[PDB]
Design an enzyme around this catalytic site. Structure first.
Site, PDB file in Angstrom:
ATOM      1  N   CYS A  44      35.471  -2.767 -51.920  1.00 49.53           N
ATOM      2  CA  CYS A  44      35.014  -1.787 -52.886  1.00 49.53           C
ATOM      3  C   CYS A  44      34.588  -0.507 -52.176  1.00 49.53           C
ATOM      4  O   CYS A  44      34.769   0.573 -52.702  1.00 49.53           O
ATOM      5  CB  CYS A  44      33.843  -2.336 -53.670  1.00 49.53           C
ATOM      6  SG  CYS A  44      32.418  -2.731 -52.655  1.00 49.53           S
ATOM      7  N   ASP A  45      34.023  -0.650 -50.982  1.00 46.19           N
ATOM      8  CA  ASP A  45      33.575   0.475 -50.184  1.00 46.19           C
ATOM      9  C   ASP A  45      34.620   0.967 -49.164  1.00 46.19           C
ATOM     10  O   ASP A  45      34.286   1.572 -48.146  1.00 46.19           O
ATOM     11  CB  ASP A  45      32.233   0.139 -49.487  1.00 46.19           C
ATOM     12  CG  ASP A  45      32.236  -1.230 -48.777  1.00 46.19           C
ATOM     13  OD1 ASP A  45      33.206  -2.001 -48.921  1.00 46.19           O
ATOM     14  OD2 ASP A  45      31.242  -1.537 -48.073  1.00 46.19           O
ATOM     15  N   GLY A  91      39.713 -15.846 -66.023  1.00 47.71           N
ATOM     16  CA  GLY A  91      39.455 -14.624 -66.767  1.00 47.71           C
ATOM     17  C   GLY A  91      38.661 -14.686 -68.062  1.00 47.71           C
ATOM     18  O   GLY A  91      37.449 -14.909 -68.042  1.00 47.71           O
ATOM     19  N   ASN A 147      37.605 -10.440 -53.405  1.00 44.02           N
ATOM     20  CA  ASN A 147      37.484  -9.943 -52.044  1.00 44.02           C
ATOM     21  C   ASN A 147      36.311 -10.411 -51.176  1.00 44.02           C
ATOM     22  O   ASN A 147      36.312 -10.180 -49.961  1.00 44.02           O
ATOM     23  CB  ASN A 147      37.583  -8.420 -52.053  1.00 44.02           C
ATOM     24  CG  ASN A 147      36.399  -7.761 -52.722  1.00 44.02           C
ATOM     25  OD1 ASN A 147      36.107  -8.023 -53.879  1.00 44.02           O
ATOM     26  ND2 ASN A 147      35.718  -6.894 -51.989  1.00 44.02           N
ATOM     27  N   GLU A 193      41.943   3.529 -58.306  1.00 42.23           N
ATOM     28  CA  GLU A 193      41.576   2.809 -57.110  1.00 42.23           C
ATOM     29  C   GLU A 193      42.791   1.901 -56.869  1.00 42.23           C
ATOM     30  O   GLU A 193      43.087   1.025 -57.687  1.00 42.23           O
ATOM     31  CB  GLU A 193      40.331   1.936 -57.330  1.00 42.23           C
ATOM     32  CG  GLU A 193      40.022   1.062 -56.102  1.00 42.23           C
ATOM     33  CD  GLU A 193      39.063  -0.076 -56.398  1.00 42.23           C
ATOM     34  OE1 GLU A 193      39.325  -0.840 -57.346  1.00 42.23           O
ATOM     35  OE2 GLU A 193      38.058  -0.211 -55.673  1.00 42.23           O
ATOM     36  N   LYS A 235      30.534 -18.017 -61.838  1.00 44.79           N
ATOM     37  CA  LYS A 235      31.917 -18.006 -62.289  1.00 44.79           C
ATOM     38  C   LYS A 235      32.653 -17.168 -61.268  1.00 44.79           C
ATOM     39  O   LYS A 235      32.656 -15.944 -61.341  1.00 44.79           O
ATOM     40  CB  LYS A 235      32.030 -17.406 -63.685  1.00 44.79           C
ATOM     41  CG  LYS A 235      33.275 -16.567 -63.909  1.00 44.79           C
ATOM     42  CD  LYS A 235      34.524 -17.391 -63.997  1.00 44.79           C
ATOM     43  CE  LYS A 235      35.713 -16.469 -64.218  1.00 44.79           C
ATOM     44  NZ  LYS A 235      36.446 -16.154 -62.960  1.00 44.79           N
ATOM     45  N   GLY A 239       4.977  -7.905 -56.829  1.00 39.65           N
ATOM     46  CA  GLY A 239       3.641  -7.339 -56.947  1.00 39.65           C
ATOM     47  C   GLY A 239       3.459  -6.935 -58.384  1.00 39.65           C
ATOM     48  O   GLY A 239       3.822  -7.679 -59.291  1.00 39.65           O
ATOM     49  N   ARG A 299       6.257  -9.053 -63.080  1.00 40.14           N
ATOM     50  CA  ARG A 299       7.614  -9.450 -63.459  1.00 40.14           C
ATOM     51  C   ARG A 299       7.737 -10.940 -63.674  1.00 40.14           C
ATOM     52  O   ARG A 299       6.947 -11.723 -63.164  1.00 40.14           O
ATOM     53  CB  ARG A 299       8.638  -9.025 -62.426  1.00 40.14           C
ATOM     54  CG  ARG A 299       8.854  -7.523 -62.348  1.00 40.14           C
ATOM     55  CD  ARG A 299       9.865  -7.234 -61.267  1.00 40.14           C
ATOM     56  NE  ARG A 299       9.784  -5.875 -60.761  1.00 40.14           N
ATOM     57  CZ  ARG A 299      10.465  -4.848 -61.247  1.00 40.14           C
ATOM     58  NH1 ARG A 299      11.298  -5.016 -62.271  1.00 40.14           N
ATOM     59  NH2 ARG A 299      10.319  -3.655 -60.675  1.00 40.14           N
ATOM     60  N   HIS A 301      28.327  -2.021 -47.268  1.00 41.26           N
ATOM     61  CA  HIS A 301      27.209  -2.628 -47.970  1.00 41.26           C
ATOM     62  C   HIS A 301      26.539  -3.737 -47.181  1.00 41.26           C
ATOM     63  O   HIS A 301      25.354  -3.994 -47.370  1.00 41.26           O
ATOM     64  CB  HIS A 301      27.684  -3.158 -49.311  1.00 41.26           C
ATOM     65  CG  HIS A 301      28.152  -2.076 -50.227  1.00 41.26           C
ATOM     66  ND1 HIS A 301      28.890  -2.322 -51.362  1.00 41.26           N
ATOM     67  CD2 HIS A 301      27.968  -0.736 -50.181  1.00 41.26           C
ATOM     68  CE1 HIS A 301      29.142  -1.185 -51.976  1.00 41.26           C
ATOM     69  NE2 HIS A 301      28.593  -0.206 -51.281  1.00 41.26           N
ATOM     70  N   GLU A 348      28.576  -3.821 -60.662  1.00 39.52           N
ATOM     71  CA  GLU A 348      29.081  -3.230 -59.427  1.00 39.52           C
ATOM     72  C   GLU A 348      30.572  -3.172 -59.706  1.00 39.52           C
ATOM     73  O   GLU A 348      31.278  -4.193 -59.609  1.00 39.52           O
ATOM     74  CB  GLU A 348      28.786  -4.157 -58.263  1.00 39.52           C
ATOM     75  CG  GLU A 348      27.335  -4.351 -57.959  1.00 39.52           C
ATOM     76  CD  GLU A 348      26.761  -3.256 -57.103  1.00 39.52           C
ATOM     77  OE1 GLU A 348      27.550  -2.469 -56.537  1.00 39.52           O
ATOM     78  OE2 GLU A 348      25.515  -3.193 -56.977  1.00 39.52           O
ATOM     79  N   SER A 356      36.277  -5.134 -61.277  1.00 39.01           N
ATOM     80  CA  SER A 356      36.874  -3.875 -61.671  1.00 39.01           C
ATOM     81  C   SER A 356      36.182  -3.244 -62.882  1.00 39.01           C
ATOM     82  O   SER A 356      35.560  -3.924 -63.713  1.00 39.01           O
ATOM     83  CB  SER A 356      38.372  -4.062 -61.974  1.00 39.01           C
ATOM     84  OG  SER A 356      38.551  -4.867 -63.116  1.00 39.01           O
TER      85      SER A 356
END
Ligand code: NAP
Ligand code: NA
Ligand code: NA
Ligand code: NA
Ligand code: NA
Lengths: 499, 499, 499, 499
Positions: C295-296, C222, C166, C393, C189, C132, C153, C453, C261, C242
């Site tokens: 992650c959660d 990597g 994961n 973590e 990637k 919108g 946008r 999530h 994230e 990470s």
């Protein structure tokens, strides 16, 4: 037959269509003849519900329907609507045939309406774009400190959908779709002139899983519907029709949520700027489509001095090079008008214009009880305002042509009619377009195209005598839903530390 | 006097207030007496406009007012409103005095309303939060490809603001504010019972720069206002009052935009979870404030078995430890009711409850033609539904108390009244609160606080007999404005390359 | 094979997966072995692109891809995504098998991820809810008078999607979906550990009609990807992984739009209020799902004095009554960890906790190079903050349990970790819940459920070391799109008349 | 003096300005000379903070500042900002004088910036228009059934505001305003060239009530600020400056929220359609204002064949009829450039253009170490792309003029520069305007006006090398705030009944 297999009853050679009473098809009230404008012949009968069946139906919709619709999660409601779309689509030819016969709609336009109904149902996913709400933090006022607000929407309950004759299928499917997607039950009251497409749409919805006690289809003639509108269990009324009936509906309804699409015609403006080929083409179409039986039909053309000549000349050529008759020959362009009465009104309106100085530029000839040629009448600015064609909406393929000195006069004449549904403006100059956009008092303005509501991809609705509120993907939620505010008080509770 | 210097006319010992006719103060219709509920004495007279003055005023508002309001840019409209706030604020004592005398409002509540009016005007800047619109790109449908949509809002023109007696000042200022900030002209029709605060607010607005031909204040009694509501130049009606008059207003008005705040009372629910001290305190206040002459007054208390005893006991103590009499002693808690007629209705409603098994827990004693003690009546669940106090809104300081087994019964009894304005829920458990929030059929739910609309920082409005639509900072734009859609056609114009 | 028919190449007994170079599958860089954590065996090889192929691919994505994606109308983009969903769904068993083998994911979780990917694609219609823009009228400032603004946008162009191990399938499909639906081209990637599900998803998209020059899949290990992130033709980088790599990515990328994230674990709080059965159940699941490689995943449990005992006791029972081993037996609950290295880190973290006063309540036993029991370690509040399990973590099925005096201590300990992804709170009291909601510094708070999530039905993302920005249906548009403002000047042009 | 009474220290004849260390003015690091471009003379000195003071300041902002800002309710934050506006406004002449002397800004432009700063603060009420959030009901997916979502925003904590030299006052006040209104603490790092207006703005804010431990003003030269950007307590960096420093800032900062306004110049397009008088006037202004030291300065003019002649001729006349010298004579039009170095770059860029076929149409003459005439250089399309004036941003009053065959070439040349801040288009035809609006890759497009960000009434920001994200009333909330999602689980709790 087919979709209506065990519903329709062949009695005395004419198929009899029952009303759907929120649970079972039936009805024990008077039977009513449904005719075709193609030959004035009776093609079916519909059974109207009795006083008691109306009362029982409303009682079912209110006590059970609201909850069946509301307690069916949105994900399933959507699946129901998408299935209904599949069912109507595979029955496309049959839905179209009924439109052609019952509404006098040209084959290609009948096919277009069925496809519009299919798309509308299928795109119910887009209606979710206006689902959400807001959070109102309370620290912007000392009085509301440590307070907090949540605002969301809720279905109203039972929505009454009253529909016109010119779009017997799409309008019912559209209203049913936006009312149901948010969790409402619905009572549909189609035009008694062509109630057949609605019966077919409802059955398809029921076959698709639509909560059986959450929908109703009542074949009630005109004022018989007043008892539905006036009932307290009906929380909202979505009405599309004439200004006059709309007025009667609100007066009978009293306080409730209303969406009133009251049509009237649309004016189209052509600036010395316009591509006249595009303009002539689009305006001609806007004048004759479905024999002008469209709320968004062009009823008045206003063109500036330097292009008035060519423009009016091109439109006239296009209108007279059309083909009337039976809606079946895909070669035909214009079918009949819904009633001979509608043609009478058109002829009387053309003479009126002529008597007041108007001159026919194309058409003007009646071809039968329900047939007429698309007509284009030239008229001087200084006399048009008193012509019936200008002051009223003559639902037929007929428009006025008026030469204007400039944009201000075009805008003034365009706003001079009592309606304010849509307006069209053809031209290129941003400044003149912006001015017209600001000053035209209408719900929608089409730049470089004829007005076309389509499936409501863009919201539309009236101003002035054209009504109030909008229909459209996402926007119709405002008419069938109510706000609910939740204010939380955490004063002195330690959530905030002075803030 | 003062603010109304050259407006008011001292004639025969009683100040005479003229109507403002969109340009000049005046009027040549009947004069009407305005009385105080404090002593039934005539404190002023108001001049009602004649048929012709009503017609001329509407004509001015329509032909010039719409444009004076609309053509004054928002930045100036805002300055006008802020100046008006300054003017009312420096005249605070005088605005308050008139409220105390004319409305019977306790000194502290009269001061609170003037301050609410001031804040409302001053916070008109927040109403802009809902100004904007959307862009609807057309490539999400093959039919709308190379097409594009813009949706925005526009003022409707002339808005009629009809106001109740219980908030003579705030309601008029609120309606005038939201109608004007978006560019509308306004006709104000205050209650004929206390039309004085409105006259003072309007003059302040006029002194602040409010376009003189864009506002009107007509002292018309009851049905005399129907001619304003029924007129086609009035595009919207914002009404706050009783369910009954609201119904009459729409039926007279026909199709137009409406905001109907029809009150009724509010139920309050107390879970075994609640801080009973907070609850007792808030509920007592909700029952007696302004002698219960508040649309959001608590009319019914529903408390679960384990707290019913303590809760009802605490509220009773608080209600009986109040002080009635004259609204002037800041020591006093409750002034008079607007009319002796209102007290009669209250007494008759208390006997009815008693006859049907109800028992008075506090109050019940009439103190004068317009004075009564705040009353709390206990009632068994199995008999409350037929009591007048439950089925109707008795505009007075009186509420029912009912013990319930659980939340479902509380919710059921709370929804059993014909109204649906607000509801209050005191308790802590998120699950039970969420359930009540979903099932209470009301415009607003207050968690752990008594219902209070305040200045509309949080939108509010009714469901069921309580009406339709909302008022609130930012939200009222929906009732005094209409959507305008602009669809641009760029098909084949090379803007997009198949998309 | 099957979907990857003519793509995969059986060479020397092991299937070889090529990179997709925005037009053709191929690659001429080093080949890399892909192993299974189930047996450390080589199950495939992937071909990494050479320097030149990376350069050529980016050049294709930039010069042609941006336009193929952008010039494909939204209606077709949607059809492409829905077709892709059909293709993945009919190949469900094969997509799942690869997840089980390549990622060590338990059969039921592998099936769940494929279904998540399918739903994500199918619900791309909901992403349109945040399409919108707004209209900004200019009359609210004297400086902007007769001026006007439109804000919308636009896709940024080429988006780089970097994904973790994961969720090899869902994360790639999710990022591709939100980047493409708005008109962007995309370079994917995937993790070099399990790049196979991504290759299968891309082929399905290509078979569904995804503009062939608008997508790329590069098997770069990597830091080989740094050359993509650092390139000016990449306008946005959507990274899930990470904290450490994320930091390196931005430093290499410089100025561009980012969605980061960065995970970390989540704390869960249990109030004396909570249904401990629900809590124990949800917390146990949050601790062990996919062997804590989420992650959660719950990494810390904080429970108030009165329920700490029962709660920790119930969770311990549930964790020890689990079954480890091979991910195939639907009877099994926990498969292996991605690498033996990951198990080493977990064991070292458990000893650390023990040395600092921690006590194992469940698990603690390593079962193989890549196998371990889900572990629950009790720890005193006064010593937990220095334990590795708290400060870092440890991507594994392991969480700490800590008894707290009250909510403030729970909140304080929960905020004491360097991460801020999600937090869970089990309890009923609205006030304590509101306090925790305000003070927990995390992107998302789950009330009465473990953090999940899912497909992003609710937006999610980090705070603190957990990153910046959100992913979710509708919300991800903010990271792959830029605002475009159009200001129109009509000063002195007669559109407005001083306003 | 005056506002800076007890802050400034007269030492050795030159006023010494200390840094504000979030509590007290001071500093014990090196002192730095501040000069005027009007005469290269030292007008003041600023004290830079030492390593330890930077560390202590950040520690204060993080541990106390975040909470002082956040725990001050919005209503008070607003009062603080409005008071600050009053204080700056009554000190208007003094704020302006410092701008003229310290920045070389012409009297009328210095007055305009102070007034912009005042308005910005005063209109902080409009920033609230984007405060809210959404409710996401969970019944649109089977997985989220009986679930529910709330999304809102939260201040990030400590925001670093780094500002350029060309708007020393407005940029600092703007960044401070949007960061503070939402509850953030702020570290301001102004250009070391003209840090004086910032010191005056901060003191005014502190006098107005701005939480003393929630703001800081550090006089750090260039890379000395890196230690602030790189610190983990700084959650967001709002940077306005050159592309090069911006790149360095992100690389030093790593993961955090960024708003990067990296300028570059703007192209302006003139269609055969344009009012050349308006165009010539606006383009001339865009070229010379503040000696072209504006990010939104016009650097390239593209005009179609038929108007190129007249247009370029008119602009040349206007540029050469300007007056250079000292910024004090309100008769003067252009003051000096910030440094002689900036003038050197401009002269070298003009020769380059000439060597590559460019021809000077106006100006070209250097008048002193910091003075130059506004220059307009004609250049053939086939050679402009390699000219320094085209490939770079030469911060000075200088633009190129290029004749083009049509819109496509204009668009292509306009997009050929590495920047994408704004673009201007003068013309009337809606179709050509829409095409240019779609294809110009810039944050903002000005139709029929020169580009002017003003106070951010309309959001603005870059594309390509011009940066990422936007600033503007209401929009800047996105850069200094983070989303917070709250998901409630009511599965099996009886809130909903299967829905
Ligand atoms: N995009 C927009 O909306 C916008 C608006 C206005 C201006 N601009 C652009 O910004 C520039 C303004 O002029 P300017 O010469 O002052 O450019 P600048 O040098 O890039 O300005 C940089 C700002 O960052 C500081 N800085 C320099 N190096 C730094 C580092 N290594 N780490 C952290 N901070 C550092 C500078 O401080 P010192 O002064 O101590 O070096 C100065 O305050 C122009 O290119 C203009 O086009 C853009
Ligand atoms: Na009614
Ligand atoms: Na009417
Ligand atoms: Na870079
Ligand atoms: Na960093």
């Amino acid at each position: 037959a087919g979709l209506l297999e065990g519903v329709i009853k062949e009695k005395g050679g004419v198929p009899v269509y029952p009303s759907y009473l929120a649970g079972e098809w039936g009805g024990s009230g008077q039977e009513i003849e449904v005719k075709s404008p193609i030959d004035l012949a009776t093609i079916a009968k519909v059974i109207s519900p009795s006083r008691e069946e109306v009362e029982r139906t409303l009682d079912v919709l209110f006590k059970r329907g609201r909850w069946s619709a509301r307690d069916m999660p949105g994900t399933e409601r959507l699946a129901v609507l998408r299935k209904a779309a599949d069912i109507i689509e595979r029955n496309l030819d049959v839905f179209a045939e009924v439109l052609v016969m019952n509404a006098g709609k040209p084959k290609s336009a009948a096919v277009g309406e069925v496809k519009a109904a299919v798309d509308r149902l299928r795109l119910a996913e887009l209606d979710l774009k206006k689902i959400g709400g807001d959070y109102i933090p309370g620290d912007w006022t000392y009085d509301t400190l440590e307070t907090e607000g949540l605002v969301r929407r809720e279905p109203l309950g039972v929505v009454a959908a009253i529909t016109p004759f010119n779009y017997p299928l799409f309008d019912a499917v559209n209203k049913i779709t936006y009312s149901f997607i948010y969790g409402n039950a619905v009572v549909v009251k189609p035009s008694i002139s062509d109630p057949l497409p609605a019966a077919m749409a409802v059955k398809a919805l029921l076959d698709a899983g639509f909560p059986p006690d959450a929908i109703a289809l009542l074949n009630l003639p005109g004022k018989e519907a007043e008892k539905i509108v006036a009932d307290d269990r009906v929380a909202a009324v979505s009405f599309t029709g004439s200004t006059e009936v709309g007025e009667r509906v609100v007066k009978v309804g009293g306080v409730k949520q209303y969406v009133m699409e009251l049509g009237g015609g649309d004016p189209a403006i052509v600036l010395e700027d316009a591509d006249l080929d595009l303009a002539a083409d689009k305006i001609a179409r806007g004048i004759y489509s479905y024999a002008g039986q469209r709320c968004d039909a062009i009823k008045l053309v206003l063109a500036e001095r330097p292009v008035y000549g060519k423009l009016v000349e091109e439109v006239a050529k296009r209108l007279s090079s059309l083909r009337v008759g039976d809606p079946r020959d895909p070669t035909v362009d214009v079918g009949p008008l819904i009633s001979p009465s509608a043609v009478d009104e058109m002829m009387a309106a053309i003479e009126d214009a002529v008597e007041k100085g108007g001159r026919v530029l194309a058409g003007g000839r009646r071809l039968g009880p329900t047939y007429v040629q698309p007509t284009f009448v030239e008229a001087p600015a200084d006399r048009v305002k008193d012509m019936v064609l200008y002051k009223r909406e003559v639902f037929a393929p007929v428009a006025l042509a008026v030469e204007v000195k400039d944009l201000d006069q075009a805008i003034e004449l365009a706003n001079g009619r009592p309606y304010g549904l849509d307006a069209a403006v053809f031209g290129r100059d941003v400044v003149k377009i912006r001015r017209a956009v600001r000053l035209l008092e209408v719900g929608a303005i089409y730049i470089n195209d004829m007005p076309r509501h389509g499936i409501g991809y863009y919201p539309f609705g009236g101003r002035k005598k054209s009504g109030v509120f909008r229909e459209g993907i996402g926007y119709a939620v405002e008419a069938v839903t109510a706000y609910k505010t939740i204010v939380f008080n955490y004063k002195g509770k330690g959530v905030w530390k002075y803030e």
